[PDB]
Design an enzyme around this catalytic site. Structure first.
Site, PDB file in Angstrom:
ATOM      1  CB  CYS A 145      -0.954   0.056   1.189  1.00 39.52           C
ATOM      2  SG  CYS A 145      -1.703   1.716   1.342  1.00 39.52           S
ATOM      3  NE  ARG A 180       2.847   0.916   3.383  1.00 40.63           N
ATOM      4  CZ  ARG A 180       3.970   0.207   3.401  1.00 40.63           C
ATOM      5  NH1 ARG A 180       4.319  -0.463   4.493  1.00 40.63           N
ATOM      6  NH2 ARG A 180       4.730   0.175   2.313  1.00 40.63           N
ATOM      7  CD1 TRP A 202      -6.790   9.564  -1.168  1.00 43.91           C
ATOM      8  CD2 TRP A 202      -7.732   9.738   0.866  1.00 43.91           C
ATOM      9  NE1 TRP A 202      -5.811   9.960  -0.286  1.00 43.91           N
ATOM     10  CE2 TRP A 202      -6.366  10.080   0.967  1.00 43.91           C
ATOM     11  CE3 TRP A 202      -8.531   9.792   2.014  1.00 43.91           C
ATOM     12  CZ2 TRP A 202      -5.783  10.443   2.181  1.00 43.91           C
ATOM     13  CZ3 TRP A 202      -7.955  10.157   3.208  1.00 43.91           C
ATOM     14  CH2 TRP A 202      -6.595  10.475   3.284  1.00 43.91           C
ATOM     15  CD  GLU A 257      -6.161   2.760  -6.064  1.00 41.97           C
ATOM     16  OE1 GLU A 257      -6.643   1.738  -5.517  1.00 41.97           O
ATOM     17  OE2 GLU A 257      -6.147   3.881  -5.506  1.00 41.97           O
TER      18      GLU A 257
HETATM   19  C1  HEM Z   1      -5.917   6.758   2.439  1.00 40.22           C
HETATM   20  C2  HEM Z   1      -5.652   6.621   1.136  1.00 40.22           C
HETATM   21  C3  HEM Z   1      -5.094   5.312   0.544  1.00 40.22           C
HETATM   22  C4  HEM Z   1      -4.493   5.234  -0.651  1.00 40.22           C
HETATM   23  C5  HEM Z   1      -4.217   6.397  -1.633  1.00 40.22           C
HETATM   24  C6  HEM Z   1      -4.097   3.862  -0.866  1.00 40.22           C
HETATM   25  C7  HEM Z   1      -3.434   3.408  -1.990  1.00 40.22           C
HETATM   26  C8  HEM Z   1      -3.302   2.090  -2.361  1.00 40.22           C
HETATM   27  C9  HEM Z   1      -3.062   1.579  -3.692  1.00 40.22           C
HETATM   28  C10 HEM Z   1      -2.869   2.428  -4.971  1.00 40.22           C
HETATM   29  C11 HEM Z   1      -3.010   0.248  -3.614  1.00 40.22           C
HETATM   30  C12 HEM Z   1      -2.788  -0.692  -4.811  1.00 40.22           C
HETATM   31  C13 HEM Z   1      -4.196  -1.279  -5.026  1.00 40.22           C
HETATM   32  C14 HEM Z   1      -4.235  -1.964  -6.355  1.00 40.22           C
HETATM   33  O1  HEM Z   1      -3.185  -1.881  -6.992  1.00 40.22           O
HETATM   34  O2  HEM Z   1      -5.259  -2.562  -6.773  1.00 40.22           O
HETATM   35  C15 HEM Z   1      -3.237  -0.157  -2.231  1.00 40.22           C
HETATM   36  C16 HEM Z   1      -3.285  -1.435  -1.698  1.00 40.22           C
HETATM   37  C17 HEM Z   1      -3.569  -1.765  -0.368  1.00 40.22           C
HETATM   38  N1  HEM Z   1      -3.982  -0.863   0.617  1.00 40.22           N
HETATM   39 FE1  HEM Z   1      -3.813   1.165   0.518  1.00 40.22          FE
HETATM   40  N2  HEM Z   1      -4.497   3.116   0.239  1.00 40.22           N
HETATM   41  C18 HEM Z   1      -5.129   3.973   1.134  1.00 40.22           C
HETATM   42  C19 HEM Z   1      -5.675   3.597   2.356  1.00 40.22           C
HETATM   43  C20 HEM Z   1      -5.590   2.344   2.917  1.00 40.22           C
HETATM   44  C21 HEM Z   1      -6.185   1.899   4.176  1.00 40.22           C
HETATM   45  C22 HEM Z   1      -7.003   2.854   5.061  1.00 40.22           C
HETATM   46  C23 HEM Z   1      -5.869   0.600   4.352  1.00 40.22           C
HETATM   47  C24 HEM Z   1      -6.194  -0.390   5.478  1.00 40.22           C
HETATM   48  C25 HEM Z   1      -6.925  -0.060   6.556  1.00 40.22           C
HETATM   49  C26 HEM Z   1      -5.088   0.194   3.206  1.00 40.22           C
HETATM   50  C27 HEM Z   1      -4.549  -1.054   3.003  1.00 40.22           C
HETATM   51  C28 HEM Z   1      -4.146  -1.571   1.795  1.00 40.22           C
HETATM   52  C29 HEM Z   1      -3.843  -2.961   1.541  1.00 40.22           C
HETATM   53  C30 HEM Z   1      -3.928  -4.056   2.625  1.00 40.22           C
HETATM   54  C31 HEM Z   1      -3.493  -3.087   0.237  1.00 40.22           C
HETATM   55  C32 HEM Z   1      -3.089  -4.387  -0.508  1.00 40.22           C
HETATM   56  C33 HEM Z   1      -1.900  -5.062   0.145  1.00 40.22           C
HETATM   57  C34 HEM Z   1      -1.780  -6.523  -0.219  1.00 40.22           C
HETATM   58  O3  HEM Z   1      -2.329  -6.999  -1.255  1.00 40.22           O
HETATM   59  O4  HEM Z   1      -1.099  -7.216   0.574  1.00 40.22           O
HETATM   60  N3  HEM Z   1      -4.932   1.276   2.362  1.00 40.22           N
HETATM   61  N4  HEM Z   1      -3.408   1.008  -1.507  1.00 40.22           N
HETATM   62  C1  LIG Z   2      -7.965   1.294   1.226  1.00 40.28           C
HETATM   63  C2  LIG Z   2      -7.584   1.337  -0.235  1.00 40.28           C
HETATM   64  C3  LIG Z   2      -7.487   2.562  -0.888  1.00 40.28           C
HETATM   65  C4  LIG Z   2      -7.141   2.574  -2.248  1.00 40.28           C
HETATM   66  N1  LIG Z   2      -7.034   3.747  -2.919  1.00 40.28           N
HETATM   67  N2  LIG Z   2      -6.938   1.412  -2.905  1.00 40.28           N
HETATM   68  C5  LIG Z   2      -7.034   0.212  -2.284  1.00 40.28           C
HETATM   69  C6  LIG Z   2      -6.803  -0.964  -2.993  1.00 40.28           C
HETATM   70  C7  LIG Z   2      -6.870  -2.201  -2.379  1.00 40.28           C
HETATM   71  C8  LIG Z   2      -6.681  -3.484  -3.129  1.00 40.28           C
HETATM   72  C9  LIG Z   2      -5.837  -4.538  -2.813  1.00 40.28           C
HETATM   73  C10 LIG Z   2      -5.851  -5.681  -3.630  1.00 40.28           C
HETATM   74  C11 LIG Z   2      -6.712  -5.798  -4.724  1.00 40.28           C
HETATM   75  O1  LIG Z   2      -6.756  -6.898  -5.559  1.00 40.28           O
HETATM   76  C12 LIG Z   2      -6.139  -8.151  -5.282  1.00 40.28           C
HETATM   77  C13 LIG Z   2      -6.374  -9.084  -6.467  1.00 40.28           C
HETATM   78  C14 LIG Z   2      -7.832  -9.538  -6.496  1.00 40.28           C
HETATM   79  C15 LIG Z   2      -6.753 -10.473  -5.961  1.00 40.28           C
HETATM   80  C16 LIG Z   2      -7.560  -4.751  -4.999  1.00 40.28           C
HETATM   81  C17 LIG Z   2      -8.531  -4.795  -6.160  1.00 40.28           C
HETATM   82  N3  LIG Z   2      -7.812  -5.053  -7.419  1.00 40.28           N
HETATM   83  C18 LIG Z   2      -7.543  -3.629  -4.200  1.00 40.28           C
HETATM   84  C19 LIG Z   2      -7.195  -2.255  -1.045  1.00 40.28           C
HETATM   85  F1  LIG Z   2      -7.286  -3.468  -0.476  1.00 40.28           F
HETATM   86  C20 LIG Z   2      -7.450  -1.090  -0.317  1.00 40.28           C
HETATM   87  C21 LIG Z   2      -7.348   0.152  -0.935  1.00 40.28           C
END
Ligand code: HEM
Ligand SMILES: Cc1cc(N)nc2cc(-c3ccc(OCC4CC4)c(CN)c3)c(F)cc12
Ligand code: HEM
Ligand SMILES: Cc1cc(N)nc2cc(-c3ccc(OCC4CC4)c(CN)c3)c(F)cc12
Ligand SMILES: C[C@H](O)[C@H](O)[C@H]1CNc2nc(N)[nH]c(=O)c2N1
Ligand SMILES: C[C@H](O)[C@H](O)[C@H]1CNc2nc(N)[nH]c(=O)c2N1
Ligand SMILES: [Zn+2]
Lengths: 418, 418
Positions: free
Chosen positions: A117, A120, A289, A294
């Site tokens: 993520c 963070r 947000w 994305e």
């Molecule tokens: C506040 C604004 C936030 C932004 C801009 C953000 C941004 C992102 C982005 C761009 C991704 C990649 C998702 C994808 O590629 O499909 C991601 C993944 C993720 N986000 Fe963040 N996020 C935010 C908040 C949070 C919050 C609040 C949480 C948890 C409480 C979180 C937990 C995660 C997790 C767990 C993943 C995927 C990690 C994995 O697959 O192991 N995010 N985030």
């Molecule tokens: C809080 C938050 C904000 C953001 N701005 N983005 C976020 C994107 C993901 C995310 C992580 C893994 C994902 O996909 C895993 C592939 C399906 C197995 C997807 C959806 N593609 C979203 C998420 F968890 C949380 C997000």
């Protein structure tokens, strides 16, 4: 054992001592690197592979020690009396219950540890909603609606997490079957092509299978499918006034409104598992947000998603016979200036991939100084367009899996006994 | 132990049995993934850490067995007599010498194994030039000039490698001190800014230090600095008629010629180490043709390279106050349509990142079927712009280090005894 990560745009060098505290595994070995496997077995949690009363107290002690160390009272009597108190309950009940303050710390640090993520820098500004008193799907639907309202905040979005009761046995499990709280339906067609969102076509049909009334269009918000305490899941439709949506226009091309695109404002992922002190929370929807890409890159332009590079390049009238005209790239940048502009002109919180990746570099500095490191997954941190004109491309990142943490889990319709 | 790699754009699944034959290490462990460290210690070769007569024969046998297995004569008498023949020479001389055919196989498979190289669909079409009879820097300069001519082939570029005598002791070492055969000089300024190429500013000054006559401009081709058999290196200037260059114009924007940009046609990296059967070749320049993005994205637009996003967006007149106008992205796509167009209109071989990454997916299919796998580094395979609209973004890749191989080595001016 005190590793070094370089930046190759700045020559900045950071030192990672935090990886020493790492407990979980990565899937890589000395002879093979799995850093690009999407869903490695280490990142997944089966409902069988819980833990047992033995396994629990290390995980509890480990968690409790880092908590009391962090409120500036390590090893104290208040700390040691909590270790004893949990110890006793782990013998008695074979499980245990977190304090409100321990649930809030544990949740914020599962986000802090989320190596994939990029957002963070915001990890301590997370609103934790304690839904552990929930008993029914209607209770779940109530808690999730309040989550949406709060986090959406009229467009000025706020990070939040809602935490349903922890797993215990494995059968009586709280689960949101939606992959995200707000998502667009996916319907296949006669000729086979897909209206809506191809990703959710499987899920869309499970809702229709349970009796959803599909307005078989494009951007139809799916209903919630909420499973409570192991009982079969039940359909609920979010009040539409609670679903904030952004119509996508362009600050130059007037024909961009004709395209007729829109997205929802709130990214709220509902299918993952929160793990705190060895307790598993199978229903823990969390939201912040969007980063523009994305939607503008993955959602709109993945071949197996909305796949709109076709029509956008058309309306730009682009050299599309030759692959090397970069007509695909050219239309991808326009689509991303449009998502940004639309979200900003509507006062809906959004971040561009340049702003967000610089913040991550800032955040990485802070974590290395005040924490000794920052686990990061380059494969996921680098944005899916213009990779190398963002600072994270040139930043070496150590990936390792700390706890508390978020994890993947199977889809409940493959495991649920109906 | 028979691992699985998925594609998430096609749902294609491949099975990697080749990683079993892996010998070298990766730098990752079960508790930490280094898949984004640029120059890990495993990918580097110090001139101290050679090998000794003991260490050599496994590496020789191992190599010889895969060679005779590949000419369809494993374990035969011709094979076993070669094992004996090398064995005897490894006892006698403590080192050994490759056949012409063994040098050509070993070289082609060091490219085949290059996990960070996206062009490998071409690995068996490699012209090997045997410069192991070379004794002087003038000899080196002669062999390198013929390499340039051949590989350049009037613009219809051909892959080639020229292989100078193998290391033996460690002091008597053949080395090309240039990082690439053709490269633009880098001069710092009074105010501190950099004319030319900032990457080579260190190297440019070592040439001036040895008496180069710098035409202190932009695209000044550096001289060759050739060290032969450990003797101090000597300056030679490639005949300019041998250096093919492409002036960079745009198929729409007429002002793009005003920018006054050009690049060389031949990418020929000269600073890496070829490793065959445990023998180290410290001077082995190798060349193919460019993928557009290496010039148009990295060379031109890296902050610490030519850094031209500034002026290009200007001449496009772009919203540059706000970061979220994506003015940087918008100008990066134009700069890459221009490099492609210019190279094609001049009949100089080039590949766009879409064409090349589809070929890599094709090549990956072939290697998994006819070889049992294909080692690949996602971090390096995905192109540095429009990552996710190319097929390699959605392709899980196993990284592991086979042999024969290419490796990094220190710059010779940090190690050479003068
Ligand atoms: C506040 C604004 C936030 C932004 C801009 C953000 C941004 C992102 C982005 C761009 C991704 C990649 C998702 C994808 O590629 O499909 C991601 C993944 C993720 N986000 Fe963040 N996020 C935010 C908040 C949070 C919050 C609040 C949480 C948890 C409480 C979180 C937990 C995660 C997790 C767990 C993943 C995927 C990690 C994995 O697959 O192991 N995010 N985030
Ligand atoms: C809080 C938050 C904000 C953001 N701005 N983005 C976020 C994107 C993901 C995310 C992580 C893994 C994902 O996909 C895993 C592939 C399906 C197995 C997807 C959806 N593609 C979203 C998420 F968890 C949380 C997000
Ligand atoms: C024929 C056309 C070729 C193309 C299009 C191509 C493409 C590429 C690209 C885009 C990179 C990334 C370079 C960078 O990011 O700076 C790369 C790296 C590399 N290429 Fe290829 N290449 C070609 C031929 C060759 C040949 C002939 C060899 C060896 C004989 C080779 C060996 C390598 C190696 C060793 C690396 C770096 C791997 C590492 O750092 O471990 N390539 N290539
Ligand atoms: C034959 C060939 C063709 C091509 N089209 N491209 C190529 C790029 C590299 C390459 C590998 C690593 C590099 O850099 C390592 C950083 C300095 C330590 C660079 C230069 N950036 C180029 C290379 F070897 C060979 C290439
Ligand atoms: C195969 C590869 O692991 C897969 O495409 C990954 C690559 N990196 C990613 N990075 C982000 N942020 N999101 C993704 O879905 C992916 N997909
Ligand atoms: C820090 C990171 O490892 C570094 O920027 C890498 C990323 N991937 C790359 N990929 C390619 N092809 N070339 C590069 O120079 C790099 N640089
Ligand atoms: Zn790894």
């Amino acid at each position: 054992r005190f590793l070094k990560v370089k930046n190759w745009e700045t020559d900045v060098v950071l030192t990672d001592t935090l990886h020493l505290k790492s407990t979980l595994e990565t899937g890589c070995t000395e002879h093979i690197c799995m850093g690009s496997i999407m869903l490695p077995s280490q990142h997944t949690r089966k409902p069988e592979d819980v833990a047992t009363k033995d396994q629990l107290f290390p995980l509890a002690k480990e968690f409790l020690d880092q908590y009391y160390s962090s409120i500036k009272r390590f090893g104290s009597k208040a700390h040691m009396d909590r270790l004893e108190e949990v110890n006793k309950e782990i013998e008695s009940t074979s499980t245990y219950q977190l304090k409100d303050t321990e649930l809030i710390y544990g949740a914020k640090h599962a986000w802090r540890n989320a190596s994939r993520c990029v957002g963070r820098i915001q990890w301590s500004k997370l609103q934790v909603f304690d839904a552990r008193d929930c008993t029914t799907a209607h209770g779940m639907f109530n808690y999730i609606c309040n989550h949406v309202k709060y986090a959406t905040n009229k467009g000025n979005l706020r990070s939040a997490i809602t935490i349903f009761p922890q797993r215990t046995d494995g059968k009586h499990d709280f689960r949101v079957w939606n992959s995200q709280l707000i998502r667009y339906a996916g319907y296949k067609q006669p000729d086979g092509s897909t209206l809506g969102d191809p990703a959710n076509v499987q899920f869309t049909e499970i809702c229709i299978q349970q009796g959803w009334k599909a307005p078989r269009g494009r951007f139809d918000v799916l209903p919630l499918l909420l499973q409570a305490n192991g009982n079969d899941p039940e359909l609920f439709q979010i009040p539409p006034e609670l679903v904030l949506e952004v119509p996508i226009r362009h600050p130059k091309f007037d024909w961009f409104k004709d395209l007729g695109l829109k997205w929802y404002g709130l990214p709220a992922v509902s299918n993952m598992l929160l793990e705190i002190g060895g307790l598993e929370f199978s229903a823990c929807p969390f939201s912040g947000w969007y980063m523009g890409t994305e939607i503008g890159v993955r959602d709109y332009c993945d071949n197996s998603r909305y796949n709109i590079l076709e029509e956008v390049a058309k309306k730009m009238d682009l050299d599309m016979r030759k692959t090397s005209s970069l007509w695909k790239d050219q239309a991808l940048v326009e689509i991303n200036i449009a998502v940004l502009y639309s979200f900003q002109s509507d006062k809906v919180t959004i971040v561009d991939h340049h702003s967000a990746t610089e913040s991550f570099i800032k955040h990485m500095e802070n974590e290395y100084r005040c924490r000794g490191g920052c686990p990061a997954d380059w494969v996921w941190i680098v944005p899916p367009m213009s990779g190398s004109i963002t600072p994270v491309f040139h930043q070496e990142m150590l990936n390792y899996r700390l706890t508390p943490s978020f994890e993947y889990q199977p889809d409940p319709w493959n495991t649920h006994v109906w």
